[PDB]
Design an enzyme around this catalytic site. Sequence first.
Site, PDB file in Angstrom:
ATOM      1  N   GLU A 183     -13.051 -10.882  12.705  1.00  0.00           N
ATOM      2  CA  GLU A 183     -13.677 -10.696  11.395  1.00  0.00           C
ATOM      3  C   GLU A 183     -13.723 -12.015  10.631  1.00  0.00           C
ATOM      4  N   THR A 189       8.240  -2.369   3.977  1.00  0.00           N
ATOM      5  CA  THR A 189       8.248  -3.821   3.842  1.00  0.00           C
ATOM      6  C   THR A 189       7.153  -4.521   4.633  1.00  0.00           C
ATOM      7  N   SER A 195       0.819  -1.211   0.000  1.00  0.00           N
ATOM      8  CA  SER A 195       0.000   0.000   0.000  1.00  0.00           C
ATOM      9  C   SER A 195       0.859   1.271   0.000  1.00  0.00           C
ATOM     10  N   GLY A 198      -5.613  -9.146   2.889  1.00  0.00           N
ATOM     11  CA  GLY A 198      -6.081  -8.261   3.935  1.00  0.00           C
ATOM     12  C   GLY A 198      -7.437  -7.650   3.643  1.00  0.00           C
ATOM     13  N   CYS A 199      -7.500  -6.304   3.602  1.00  0.00           N
ATOM     14  CA  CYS A 199      -8.777  -5.584   3.558  1.00  0.00           C
ATOM     15  C   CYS A 199      -9.662  -6.009   2.381  1.00  0.00           C
ATOM     16  N   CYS A 219      -2.897  -5.789   2.122  1.00  0.00           N
ATOM     17  CA  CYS A 219      -4.305  -5.414   1.998  1.00  0.00           C
ATOM     18  C   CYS A 219      -4.928  -6.005   0.738  1.00  0.00           C
ATOM     19  N   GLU A 275     -28.312   9.372  11.508  1.00  0.00           N
ATOM     20  CA  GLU A 275     -28.975  10.566  12.026  1.00  0.00           C
ATOM     21  C   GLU A 275     -29.134  10.541  13.543  1.00  0.00           C
ATOM     22  N   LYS A 312     -11.006  -9.766   2.667  1.00  0.00           N
ATOM     23  CA  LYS A 312     -11.762 -10.030   3.890  1.00  0.00           C
ATOM     24  C   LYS A 312     -13.125  -9.349   3.842  1.00  0.00           C
ATOM     25  N   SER A 337      -7.949 -10.460  18.099  1.00  0.00           N
ATOM     26  CA  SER A 337      -7.760  -9.212  17.379  1.00  0.00           C
ATOM     27  C   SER A 337      -8.867  -9.040  16.354  1.00  0.00           C
ATOM     28  N   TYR A 338      -8.835  -7.919  15.635  1.00  0.00           N
ATOM     29  CA  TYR A 338      -9.859  -7.716  14.621  1.00  0.00           C
ATOM     30  C   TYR A 338      -9.769  -8.787  13.533  1.00  0.00           C
ATOM     31  N   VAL A 339      -8.547  -9.192  13.153  1.00  0.00           N
ATOM     32  CA  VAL A 339      -8.374 -10.244  12.144  1.00  0.00           C
ATOM     33  C   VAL A 339      -9.115 -11.510  12.562  1.00  0.00           C
ATOM     34  N   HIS A 387     -33.202  11.620   7.255  1.00  0.00           N
ATOM     35  CA  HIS A 387     -34.146  10.622   7.729  1.00  0.00           C
ATOM     36  C   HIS A 387     -34.808   9.935   6.543  1.00  0.00           C
TER      37      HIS A 387
HETATM   38  C1  FAD Z   1     -44.058  10.186  -0.126  1.00  0.00           C
HETATM   39  C2  FAD Z   1     -43.289  11.076   0.813  1.00  0.00           C
HETATM   40  C3  FAD Z   1     -42.016  10.693   1.223  1.00  0.00           C
HETATM   41  C4  FAD Z   1     -41.276  11.482   2.099  1.00  0.00           C
HETATM   42  N1  FAD Z   1     -40.015  11.050   2.473  1.00  0.00           N
HETATM   43  C5  FAD Z   1     -39.326  11.799   3.293  1.00  0.00           C
HETATM   44  C6  FAD Z   1     -38.010  11.337   3.700  1.00  0.00           C
HETATM   45  O1  FAD Z   1     -37.463  10.293   3.338  1.00  0.00           O
HETATM   46  N2  FAD Z   1     -37.357  12.203   4.575  1.00  0.00           N
HETATM   47  C7  FAD Z   1     -37.851  13.398   5.067  1.00  0.00           C
HETATM   48  O2  FAD Z   1     -37.137  14.043   5.840  1.00  0.00           O
HETATM   49  N3  FAD Z   1     -39.095  13.826   4.690  1.00  0.00           N
HETATM   50  C8  FAD Z   1     -39.790  13.051   3.837  1.00  0.00           C
HETATM   51  N4  FAD Z   1     -41.042  13.464   3.448  1.00  0.00           N
HETATM   52  C9  FAD Z   1     -41.546  14.724   3.977  1.00  0.00           C
HETATM   53  C10 FAD Z   1     -42.117  14.576   5.373  1.00  0.00           C
HETATM   54  O3  FAD Z   1     -43.150  13.592   5.365  1.00  0.00           O
HETATM   55  C11 FAD Z   1     -42.658  15.926   5.835  1.00  0.00           C
HETATM   56  O4  FAD Z   1     -41.627  16.908   5.756  1.00  0.00           O
HETATM   57  C12 FAD Z   1     -43.214  15.896   7.258  1.00  0.00           C
HETATM   58  O5  FAD Z   1     -44.112  14.795   7.422  1.00  0.00           O
HETATM   59  C13 FAD Z   1     -43.890  17.203   7.604  1.00  0.00           C
HETATM   60  O6  FAD Z   1     -44.286  17.166   8.985  1.00  0.00           O
HETATM   61  P1  FAD Z   1     -45.316  18.202   9.559  1.00  0.00           P
HETATM   62  O7  FAD Z   1     -45.274  18.005  11.080  1.00  0.00           O
HETATM   63  O8  FAD Z   1     -45.005  19.580   9.078  1.00  0.00           O
HETATM   64  O9  FAD Z   1     -46.738  17.726   8.964  1.00  0.00           O
HETATM   65  P2  FAD Z   1     -47.411  16.296   8.762  1.00  0.00           P
HETATM   66  O10 FAD Z   1     -46.436  15.219   9.061  1.00  0.00           O
HETATM   67  O11 FAD Z   1     -48.088  16.287   7.363  1.00  0.00           O
HETATM   68  O12 FAD Z   1     -48.530  16.237   9.906  1.00  0.00           O
HETATM   69  C14 FAD Z   1     -49.672  17.118   9.900  1.00  0.00           C
HETATM   70  C15 FAD Z   1     -50.800  16.341  10.536  1.00  0.00           C
HETATM   71  O13 FAD Z   1     -51.877  17.234  10.915  1.00  0.00           O
HETATM   72  C16 FAD Z   1     -53.089  16.710  10.417  1.00  0.00           C
HETATM   73  N5  FAD Z   1     -54.042  17.795  10.220  1.00  0.00           N
HETATM   74  C17 FAD Z   1     -54.223  18.557   9.093  1.00  0.00           C
HETATM   75  N6  FAD Z   1     -55.169  19.460   9.206  1.00  0.00           N
HETATM   76  C18 FAD Z   1     -55.654  19.269  10.494  1.00  0.00           C
HETATM   77  C19 FAD Z   1     -56.659  19.922  11.239  1.00  0.00           C
HETATM   78  N7  FAD Z   1     -57.398  20.928  10.764  1.00  0.00           N
HETATM   79  N8  FAD Z   1     -56.877  19.500  12.508  1.00  0.00           N
HETATM   80  C20 FAD Z   1     -56.143  18.488  12.984  1.00  0.00           C
HETATM   81  N9  FAD Z   1     -55.166  17.801  12.379  1.00  0.00           N
HETATM   82  C21 FAD Z   1     -54.970  18.243  11.129  1.00  0.00           C
HETATM   83  C22 FAD Z   1     -52.698  15.975   9.147  1.00  0.00           C
HETATM   84  O14 FAD Z   1     -53.761  15.107   8.774  1.00  0.00           O
HETATM   85  C23 FAD Z   1     -51.432  15.276   9.642  1.00  0.00           C
HETATM   86  O15 FAD Z   1     -51.750  14.135  10.429  1.00  0.00           O
HETATM   87  C24 FAD Z   1     -41.826  12.682   2.573  1.00  0.00           C
HETATM   88  C25 FAD Z   1     -43.095  13.079   2.158  1.00  0.00           C
HETATM   89  C26 FAD Z   1     -43.835  12.286   1.281  1.00  0.00           C
HETATM   90  C27 FAD Z   1     -45.212  12.730   0.851  1.00  0.00           C
HETATM   91  C1  FAD Z   2      -6.239  -9.772   7.583  1.00  0.00           C
HETATM   92  C2  FAD Z   2      -5.928  -8.300   7.510  1.00  0.00           C
HETATM   93  C3  FAD Z   2      -6.960  -7.402   7.263  1.00  0.00           C
HETATM   94  C4  FAD Z   2      -6.715  -6.036   7.165  1.00  0.00           C
HETATM   95  N1  FAD Z   2      -7.789  -5.183   6.935  1.00  0.00           N
HETATM   96  C5  FAD Z   2      -7.555  -3.915   6.857  1.00  0.00           C
HETATM   97  C6  FAD Z   2      -8.675  -3.040   6.584  1.00  0.00           C
HETATM   98  O1  FAD Z   2      -9.843  -3.405   6.422  1.00  0.00           O
HETATM   99  N2  FAD Z   2      -8.326  -1.679   6.511  1.00  0.00           N
HETATM  100  C7  FAD Z   2      -7.042  -1.150   6.662  1.00  0.00           C
HETATM  101  O2  FAD Z   2      -6.890   0.075   6.569  1.00  0.00           O
HETATM  102  N3  FAD Z   2      -5.992  -1.993   6.913  1.00  0.00           N
HETATM  103  C8  FAD Z   2      -6.249  -3.311   6.996  1.00  0.00           C
HETATM  104  N4  FAD Z   2      -5.197  -4.163   7.233  1.00  0.00           N
HETATM  105  C9  FAD Z   2      -3.861  -3.588   7.394  1.00  0.00           C
HETATM  106  C10 FAD Z   2      -3.172  -3.320   6.067  1.00  0.00           C
HETATM  107  O3  FAD Z   2      -3.035  -4.537   5.333  1.00  0.00           O
HETATM  108  C11 FAD Z   2      -1.786  -2.740   6.334  1.00  0.00           C
HETATM  109  O4  FAD Z   2      -1.902  -1.652   7.242  1.00  0.00           O
HETATM  110  C12 FAD Z   2      -1.089  -2.258   5.061  1.00  0.00           C
HETATM  111  O5  FAD Z   2      -0.888  -3.355   4.168  1.00  0.00           O
HETATM  112  C13 FAD Z   2       0.216  -1.549   5.345  1.00  0.00           C
HETATM  113  O6  FAD Z   2       0.917  -1.342   4.100  1.00  0.00           O
HETATM  114  P1  FAD Z   2       2.488  -1.453   4.021  1.00  0.00           P
HETATM  115  O7  FAD Z   2       2.845  -0.825   2.668  1.00  0.00           O
HETATM  116  O8  FAD Z   2       3.062  -0.874   5.291  1.00  0.00           O
HETATM  117  O9  FAD Z   2       2.778  -3.032   3.980  1.00  0.00           O
HETATM  118  P2  FAD Z   2       2.362  -4.182   2.967  1.00  0.00           P
HETATM  119  O10 FAD Z   2       1.094  -3.828   2.289  1.00  0.00           O
HETATM  120  O11 FAD Z   2       2.326  -5.489   3.790  1.00  0.00           O
HETATM  121  O12 FAD Z   2       3.512  -4.202   1.823  1.00  0.00           O
HETATM  122  C14 FAD Z   2       4.861  -4.619   2.110  1.00  0.00           C
HETATM  123  C15 FAD Z   2       5.311  -5.380   0.897  1.00  0.00           C
HETATM  124  O13 FAD Z   2       6.752  -5.493   0.894  1.00  0.00           O
HETATM  125  C16 FAD Z   2       7.096  -6.833   0.621  1.00  0.00           C
HETATM  126  N5  FAD Z   2       8.422  -7.091   1.166  1.00  0.00           N
HETATM  127  C17 FAD Z   2       8.732  -7.498   2.438  1.00  0.00           C
HETATM  128  N6  FAD Z   2      10.016  -7.643   2.656  1.00  0.00           N
HETATM  129  C18 FAD Z   2      10.592  -7.318   1.437  1.00  0.00           C
HETATM  130  C19 FAD Z   2      11.931  -7.276   1.004  1.00  0.00           C
HETATM  131  N7  FAD Z   2      12.968  -7.571   1.792  1.00  0.00           N
HETATM  132  N8  FAD Z   2      12.166  -6.905  -0.284  1.00  0.00           N
HETATM  133  C20 FAD Z   2      11.127  -6.592  -1.063  1.00  0.00           C
HETATM  134  N9  FAD Z   2       9.826  -6.596  -0.761  1.00  0.00           N
HETATM  135  C21 FAD Z   2       9.623  -6.972   0.510  1.00  0.00           C
HETATM  136  C22 FAD Z   2       5.970  -7.652   1.239  1.00  0.00           C
HETATM  137  O14 FAD Z   2       5.946  -9.011   0.802  1.00  0.00           O
HETATM  138  C23 FAD Z   2       4.772  -6.808   0.789  1.00  0.00           C
HETATM  139  O15 FAD Z   2       4.384  -7.070  -0.555  1.00  0.00           O
HETATM  140  C24 FAD Z   2      -5.404  -5.559   7.323  1.00  0.00           C
HETATM  141  C25 FAD Z   2      -4.367  -6.453   7.580  1.00  0.00           C
HETATM  142  C26 FAD Z   2      -4.615  -7.822   7.668  1.00  0.00           C
HETATM  143  C27 FAD Z   2      -3.470  -8.770   7.909  1.00  0.00           C
END
Ligand code: FAD
Ligand code: FAD
Lengths: 588, 588
Positions: free
Chosen positions: B295, B252, B112, B153-154, B149, B571, B157, B290-292, B566
């Site tokens: 995981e 290395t 790496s 490694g990464c 990696c 969130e 895995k 360890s993590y290895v 949301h």
């Molecule tokens: C299909 C769809 C998907 C959406 N997806 C997302 C999303 O992923 N993320 C996001 O952040 N927002 C999303 N929204 C927007 C989100 O639903 C609105 O921003 C949020 O519900 C508004 O909240 P509010 O409290 O202003 O009104 P509302 O949630 O509409 O509540 C008002 C309530 O008061 C009631 N009411 C109305 N008039 C009267 C009355 N005269 N007397 C008594 N009660 C009354 C209504 O019937 C309702 O129950 C989505 C909207 C839709 C339509």
């Molecule tokens: C199972 C496992 C999972 C991992 N998962 C993650 C992960 O999800 N995320 C993350 O960020 N890190 C992860 N790591 C760590 C990551 O692999 C190392 O941090 C990273 O490889 C470090 O890079 P490096 O260049 O220091 O060494 P290396 O990538 O090991 O490279 C060194 C290289 O030099 C070579 N070498 C050695 N001696 C000599 C020599 N004398 N002459 C020439 N070449 C030589 C080696 O054979 C090798 O090819 C994981 C490690 C393991 C073991």
Amino acid sequence: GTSQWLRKTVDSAAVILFSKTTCPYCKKVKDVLAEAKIKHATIELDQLSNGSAIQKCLASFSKIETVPQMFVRGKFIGDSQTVLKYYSNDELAGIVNESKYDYDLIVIGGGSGGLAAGKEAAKYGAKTAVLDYVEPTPIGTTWGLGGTCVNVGCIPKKLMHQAGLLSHALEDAEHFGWSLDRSKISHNWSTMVEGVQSHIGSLNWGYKVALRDNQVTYLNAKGRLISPHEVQITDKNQKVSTITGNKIILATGERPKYPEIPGAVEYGITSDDLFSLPYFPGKTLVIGASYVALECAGFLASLGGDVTVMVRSILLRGFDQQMAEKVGDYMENHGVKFAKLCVPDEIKQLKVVDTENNKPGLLLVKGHYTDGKKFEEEFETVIFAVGREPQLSKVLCETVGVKLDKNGRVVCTDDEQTTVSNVYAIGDINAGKPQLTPVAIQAGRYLARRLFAGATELTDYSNVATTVFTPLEYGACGLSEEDAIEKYGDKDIEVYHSNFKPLEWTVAHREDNVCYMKLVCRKSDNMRVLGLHVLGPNAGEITQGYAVAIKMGATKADFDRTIGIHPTCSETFTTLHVTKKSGVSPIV
Amino acid sequence: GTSQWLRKTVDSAAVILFSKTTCPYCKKVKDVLAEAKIKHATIELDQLSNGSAIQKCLASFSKIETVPQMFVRGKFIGDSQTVLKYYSNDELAGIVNESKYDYDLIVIGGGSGGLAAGKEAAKYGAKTAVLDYVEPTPIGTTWGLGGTCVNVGCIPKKLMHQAGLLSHALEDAEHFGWSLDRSKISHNWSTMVEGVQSHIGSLNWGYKVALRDNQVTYLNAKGRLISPHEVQITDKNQKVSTITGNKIILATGERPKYPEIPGAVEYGITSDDLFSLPYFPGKTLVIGASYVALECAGFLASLGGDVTVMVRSILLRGFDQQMAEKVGDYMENHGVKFAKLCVPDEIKQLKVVDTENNKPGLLLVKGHYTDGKKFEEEFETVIFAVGREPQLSKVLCETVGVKLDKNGRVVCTDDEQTTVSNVYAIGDINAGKPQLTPVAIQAGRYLARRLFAGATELTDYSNVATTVFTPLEYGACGLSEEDAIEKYGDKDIEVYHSNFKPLEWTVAHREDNVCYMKLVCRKSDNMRVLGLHVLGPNAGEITQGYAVAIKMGATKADFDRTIGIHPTCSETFTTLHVTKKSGVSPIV
Ligand SMILES: Cc1cc2nc3c(=O)[nH]c(=O)nc-3n(C[C@H](O)[C@H](O)[C@H](O)COP(=O)(O)OP(=O)(O)OC[C@H]3O[C@@H](n4cnc5c(N)ncnc54)[C@H](O)[C@@H]3O)c2cc1C
Ligand SMILES: Cc1cc2nc3c(=O)[nH]c(=O)nc-3n(C[C@H](O)[C@H](O)[C@H](O)COP(=O)(O)OP(=O)(O)OC[C@H]3O[C@@H](n4cnc5c(N)ncnc54)[C@H](O)[C@@H]3O)c2cc1C
Ligand SMILES: Oc1ccc(CNCc2cccs2)cc1
């Protein structure tokens, strides 16, 4: 100075105790109030950074400068001995319950913001009522407490989005070594609606219980503000009456529009109906191009439906249009058809919905394109996603004096206050704010703390991150590229961008260069990040953390000096380097 | 100050042009160099905050104060007339290839960090060689260019982790409406390994192609440093020879450790062999914590294997221990057996591995618990995951002067320089640094810029986020909670935490309160976020973005003012409120 803060708090709070932490006389009052089941706000002055000045202005109300002082709806009640005297005389209940109106707060609307505001207000001793009523759709669909997101919005569509996504996992499974036969696998619509509806039902009931255990009165009634402190309510048995409250919060949200064309209301449905429809839609036509339209077309095609989307002009108006086109190109290549630059003229019924057999009807759609040529095709279902809108004439008597902008939304100050001094509005009906559920919840929570607890925190409405949950999800925080250019000039804008490929997609033999991300940056301001954009799986989980960095003023340099987590999709943001001005390709 | 920078840059740069973006004489030299395929660094004086004093200080070497000025390996070559003359007369190629050494840069190690340093240096005209040789394991396993990696490694895995996660999609599918019978579905190990190895092979190939295209010399040979500028190379034909370079980067890496017990090397394997094993491990004992270890035990279980982990003391030493115990508890509730407080004493062979029928052997493992009771059980495969170590004896002659810490790792200044002024070390062998691929890469690219392009930027090793890809993933950025208390004291540490449930888990009937997150904050420093922790799905996608805000000094208030997306899991970080000191339950 501090004096105008203290008077605002005292006049607004329902029950509030100005106390101190190392004060055993204050503890005696807290414990007494707690045993009497009396909820209240508390202002610990030894923790606020100018409590000495506050303790002085307190004397303007109570003629004493010591601690504790307890107040009820603007009135000074006593020090420790006086409240303790009231308690052992059985006079404390009738004093804390003494009010000019029936409630301290009436919330019209039990959706995202409404319910949030109501529970938070109740914590601090405000007698609170929450009104909710769900007016049925044209075909009569109805649902329980919770609002649009809970019942016919974010919660059901994302669960159906997820059912769609699971189809990709059955596609990928052979490449990763699982021996299942994907070609003999069908999806059952009604089974999935049952599981979605069952989770929904558990949320209505969860909310009814929450209100009960917070001493909030839930009234399943239609509210109408006939005067600044008077709310008129209609039963489920038509019964009419009037209740009064000190503060009113309007939170009634929106409902889906229909185009003014023959057949639309009679023969189409909207998203309000789609999430509890008892039959599979069948061959479907989604008319519109908002995130609702694209998200719903997206999961119907993924569940094996025959889906067409009819687009007046462009996809996702108001969103970054390079990203919208990438989103729409993914869908068109993976089984969603589009009738571009086309518009509906009428819906003709050929077959009535069959309630018995649980089948859709048959419809004939007549439309035309902008060259003039005619659209004519039959579909079993037609869904209208042509926008949403409030109906505040059902809610708000014109004589009360709440000012509405030209779309029908409420004009408010930056603390949600209307043009009538005791009335506030939150959520979708607050003119010009992002219409999103987390915004309505933060608005309604923060506002309750200001009215009944003396808080000063405002809701921050800028750079609120979004995610569109199309088949390939699209996450965004900040300015679109065209908006950033139009605001600062093309010479001042640098855009870093790159394609990527999820490591999961390699063994599954998926596309190399469809996932895409970019940072939009202002040159003249330390390469400040004006907007982030990413098209890929889990785009919401990817975008969210970066919304904190962007709220803090992140620059390109901040992104460079942070190290990636490997192997992730999101780590590609930490090493972007190809600029758009350079002309170098962004592919992998 | 400026004077010392300019002399360090001119002394180690291979080919370097001092220039200005407006000067049309400098544009003339750039075009000649471009046409002659002469790669070079360029410094544009008018883009630097102190190009005036730099332009003066240049005259100390060239006796002129104007631009352009071209240098080669410390020596001033000419202004524009002198360069043009050299080109015109066929003299330029010989001048620019003039070196006291064979190479400007020799990288020992092609992983790496090593690959990343080499490619970056080549871009600025450094004549570069990278050496890479893979010592085979005890049973013979060996692999191609890329490092740990890419090959063992990464990359393999996470693909294997992903195959395991796919099994939950097929469990979850029935609840979202898909028909399939989860019971008549089985997994084929060798099919999976073929797909993994195919992607790895395309990475081995891609890297040889990238070095070829950057004119980097790639020698598949083992390197030994015998003097500060002399690297002894040994062939796959055992041919020995000596090559020289100005700058040396040691990169290395490390290899798995084995316990010194009878039978461990003869009959056990390690992760180096796991990812290309031709037969399924079968009933498996993983020895380690360890993590290895976790995981690998994780994905083996999800693929239907009978897996036991043998733990000496605790899980994931060095990680936040509450988070580690929630990780192990989850694995144990989902089909991983644990032998706690146990260590192995010897491995006995009952069956030789069956190459013919492609099956594993059979083994008897004897051990004991920390209280003396005996352990004895049969497994088909025993995987050791008991740490990793460098072998710098095989790379570094004693007489050269490269200081080592007590672990065999190399002691380096904050610019990766060793005790020998022209030898540097990056990646896993750099003492005291987080052993991660993104870290090794960033250090190699930044170091190459400093050696051959005049850069000053150092690599920032603080607060590097991490993700552990167990069946339930665990992402982290900053301090463990126990570390944060040890450093600042308990009274100064506040912890906000919550459980959570992915919306995707509702219809799937998965557990309510197993996912968990917390923010560890410092009361006296504005409630600064000192550590972020999340256990749940897509934990690396969740955590990554927040690492940028942590780098910028994010506080609890910064999280509160940002709105959530949301519906997401991530969130939940934007509305955390229960503290550990309050003793309130974190369930939902
Ligand atoms: C299909 C769809 C998907 C959406 N997806 C997302 C999303 O992923 N993320 C996001 O952040 N927002 C999303 N929204 C927007 C989100 O639903 C609105 O921003 C949020 O519900 C508004 O909240 P509010 O409290 O202003 O009104 P509302 O949630 O509409 O509540 C008002 C309530 O008061 C009631 N009411 C109305 N008039 C009267 C009355 N005269 N007397 C008594 N009660 C009354 C209504 O019937 C309702 O129950 C989505 C909207 C839709 C339509
Ligand atoms: C199972 C496992 C999972 C991992 N998962 C993650 C992960 O999800 N995320 C993350 O960020 N890190 C992860 N790591 C760590 C990551 O692999 C190392 O941090 C990273 O490889 C470090 O890079 P490096 O260049 O220091 O060494 P290396 O990538 O090991 O490279 C060194 C290289 O030099 C070579 N070498 C050695 N001696 C000599 C020599 N004398 N002459 C020439 N070449 C030589 C080696 O054979 C090798 O090819 C994981 C490690 C393991 C073991
Ligand atoms: O981080 C992740 C990256 C990819 C995947 C699997 N891809 C799912 C999809 C296929 C098509 C659209 S989305 C899971 C997690």
